[PDB]
Amino acid sequence: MNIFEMLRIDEGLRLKIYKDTEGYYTAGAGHLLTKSPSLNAAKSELDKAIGRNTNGVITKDEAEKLFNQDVDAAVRGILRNAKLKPVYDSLDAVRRAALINMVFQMGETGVAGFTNSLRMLQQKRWDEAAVNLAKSRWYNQTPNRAKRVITTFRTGTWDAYK
Ligand SMILES: [Cl-]
Ligand SMILES: [Cl-]
16 A cells, blocks of 8 residues: 555545535546636636646546646645654654645645644654544544544554555
8 A cells, every 4th residue: 555545545536527525626636626616717727737628527647647746745745844844754654644645635734733633643642643633623524534544643554444
C-alpha cells in the first residue's frame, strides 16, 4: 500500500465533474474545482487545469495527471508549512501518509489548525491523538474516512485500508 493507493480508496476517481461531500464541483480524484455554485465556472476551471475544452469530461490519464500534481502539492505544502513540517519529519512512513491524506482533503491551513493533535502526534502519544482527532467537524462529517486515517495514525499500519 502507498499514498496513491490510499487516496485512491478515499477519493475514488471520476471522469466527469461531480459534487463532493460538501456539494462542491470536483473532478478526478478529489480535485476541487470551485466552491462556487456555477457549473460553468466549474467547467472553466476544469479546462484551464487540463489545457483543453473538456466539456466536463476527462480521460483517465488526464485524471491521473491531476492526481499526481495534487499529491506532489500536498507534500510540498507540508514541507513549507512551519507547523506541519516538524510533525511530518517526526513521523514514520505510514503515518506520514496519513498526514498527507488529511492535507489533501482539507488543505494545509485546515490541518495546521489541529494544534493539539499535531502536538500529540509529534510526541508519539498515539491513543491520545486519536481521541483528539475525533473531536472535530471532519470526523463528524466524513466518519468512515476519518476513522480510516485515525486508525492509521493510531497503529502505524495500513490495516484500515486492507
Ligand atoms: Cl490545477
Ligand atoms: Cl466518510
